[PDB]
A paper describes a structure:
Studying protein structures at ambient temperature offers valuable insights into their natural conformational dynamics, active-site flexibility, functional mechanisms and binding behavior. Therefore, in addition to the structure obtained at cryogenic temperature, we also determined the structure of wild-type CbFDH at ambient temperature. 97.66% of the residues were in the favored regions, while 2.34% were in the allowed regions, with no outliers according to the Ramachandran statistics. Comparison of the wild-type structures determined at cryogenic and ambient temperatures showed that the structure did not significantly change due to temperature except for flexible loops and large amino-acid side chains. The reason might be that flash-cooling in liquid nitrogen captured the protein in its most stable state in solution, which we also observed in the ambient temperature structure. The cryogenic temperature structure exhibited a significantly higher number of identified water molecules, with 2179 waters resolved, compared with the ambient temperature structure with only 393 water molecules. The higher resolution achieved at cryogenic temperatures significantly improves the accuracy of identifying water molecules compared with the ambient temperature structures at lower resolution. Another reason for the different numbers of identified water molecules could be the differences in water accessibility and occupancy between the two conditions. At cryogenic temperatures water molecules might be frozen at specific binding sites, leading to the stabilization of interactions that are transient at ambient temperature.
Residue numbers in the entry:
A (entry chain B): 1 to 353
B (entry chain A): 1 to 356
The structure:
Amino acid sequence: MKIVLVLYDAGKHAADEEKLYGCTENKLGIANWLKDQGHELITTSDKEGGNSVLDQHIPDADIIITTPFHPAYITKERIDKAKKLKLVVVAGVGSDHIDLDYINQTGKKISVLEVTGSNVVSVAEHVLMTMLVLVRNFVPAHEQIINHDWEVAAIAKDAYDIEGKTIATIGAGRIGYRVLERLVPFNPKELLYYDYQALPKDAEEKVGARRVENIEELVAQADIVTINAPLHAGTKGLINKELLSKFKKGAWLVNTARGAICVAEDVAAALESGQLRGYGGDVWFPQPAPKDHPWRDMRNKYGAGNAMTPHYSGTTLDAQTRYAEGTKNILESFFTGKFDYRPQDIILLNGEY
Amino acid sequence: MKIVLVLYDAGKHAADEEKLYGCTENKLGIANWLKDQGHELITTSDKEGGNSVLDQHIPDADIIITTPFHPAYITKERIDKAKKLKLVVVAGVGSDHIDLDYINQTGKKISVLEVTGSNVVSVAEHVLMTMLVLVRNFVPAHEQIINHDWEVAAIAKDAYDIEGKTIATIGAGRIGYRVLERLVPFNPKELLYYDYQALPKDAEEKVGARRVENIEELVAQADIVTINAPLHAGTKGLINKELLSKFKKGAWLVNTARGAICVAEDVAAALESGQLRGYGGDVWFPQPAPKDHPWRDMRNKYGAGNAMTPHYSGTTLDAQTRYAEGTKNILESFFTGKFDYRPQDIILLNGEYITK
């Protein structure tokens, strides 16, 4: 079979770190395994334009492997020309870039699977780190040192302990709950959550969480808000100026789910005006963020309150090992004809939900 | 009575934030309380030199109040001239700037107290933050964004999850144990500790810690090492070229206890050579850190691995409230003649140690 694998070029960075599996130069660490079975692997990062390498091999590709960190868009046109396509794998979590609805609508026997759960711990750690960095005012603290200054009172005037604060998550799924687990020993005043379905009673009691019924009430009483909910019609532009004015004055806000859940200019305005004390996360809209994206230069009144990073929380070396191993398990189930997929990994089974 | 209060000057920042109690401008929020009680308060940051404000009022001061973040050194020479000194207070935790030995050995009747426990959570949170920052390679990640760059592979190649890592602490006291308590739900591979005495069996089971008899074996197997021990003859210069050579290759190291526990240039050389992946903390020697202190500019081979900050982990606004309240409670015990101090706050009571 012909496998096409779309990843980013890591350049010289690939050669320093051989554990960096998710690049074109290291090919998820499965290139030899695919060769041993007897299979043709096409690896490329060129995914844009009609004449791209990806489009030259789509007509006869049996399998396409993509990643959310260099996402090849599987469009209606591309699916039309994919005569032999049987399986699409996301080496990671996230299928925004796949036209799932059209595949289902045409009747083609195409399976779409992802490595469910490979990213949850990585992202949840990123949230807590981001929380601590913002609350404890770490960014200006470190900037002082490498600028060769020493002025504690400039740092301490906006520095707080995370102990004794009310922390709220919008969304209590895999990521949001594991965030709540890690906050317990820090002794928050209260842990709150809002979601479209209740946490199981036993899960709720393990973390001492309280469910709030509507979002305006949740953010009104929370010192810290973290966004851990999927992007659909209900959450698109959810964080706009009207809701932000309902936030506790001087709150902290973390978002690692999807940049489009926020209105970029409203968040920046709130940080400048003081409605927010800090904003941090690793998701942007548009993504990758242009040089002019307002979230790059936004700062609270003190020149701080920005804990932004590129989209890498889920591409740590430990997560990549899980992506590579999960992709191998998925291909194994498909090559052998067993189709013994993990149920949580199936997005579409032969064109069906 | 006369009280001398020695804090740093916060300048404009005091105006920005009324809750910034630990500066000369806001005087721990007790100035009006002391005035009503009819005492004389002296507030100064001038603490060095023989004609400083501190030395001008030492001869007849009844009480001196200090902070570790702008320490006035209660030396033998200064103790000899304090004719009326009865009480020395640490608005915070830390007594290295006080000559406790001279007081206890002479027998002068001076009580020394500190606000015990008021810094523990603040410091422990700072330790977890630094660990996640270094392990997840956050500093180069952020510098990319504010420099208007976007290159994920340059960050991802040295970024890790703290899950499944081996974490060890040198010292399992109040702060050391707190760090372990908060690490448990991050699912480390194993938690280790080294100390001159063992934790109680229950304390060990709660965090699932395993004791390691000698440091050389502790560091050799640890992905992450954090120092939470006091500075004494056994820990001064502990982290040096010899011991660092026996760390696990590519180790992360965090220190929020005392700068002198490390040899500054041995650490920098270890970081530059690849022995350490990163180093972080808020404690320095000398402190405040000179502009050319090597720890400011050191970086790992990728230009990352530095998570240093000024000495501020225990002076967050939450902690300063605890420091300010505790000082007021201590003075109230002294002024009323009750001397009903919290037992854990006493370092020396009338020049004598007490059962702990």
